[PDB]
């Protein structure tokens, strides 16, 4: 399953941009992983 994970990661992006760049980069990598699969 990639759909709910994409949804959720999307929402903690749009909820907390104030996270340090580390979390943003890691989470974007996670979304790139899910759409790659």
């Amino acid at each position: 399953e990639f759909i709910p994970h994409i949804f959720y990661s999307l929402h903690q992006i749009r909820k907390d941009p104030n996270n340090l760049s580390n979390q943003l980069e890691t989470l974007t990598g996670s979304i790139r992983h899910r759409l790659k699969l």
Partner: peptide, 27 residues
């Protein structure tokens, strides 16, 4: 060879395509 032509004919293929493009722009 006609398989990919049939696949490109249905809209949701284009949908996944520009969805990938939009995430590429976002990243």
């Amino acid at each position: 060879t006609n398989s990919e032509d049939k696949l490109s004919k249905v809209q949701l293929y284009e949908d996944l395509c520009r969805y990938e493009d939009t995430l590429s722009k976002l990243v």
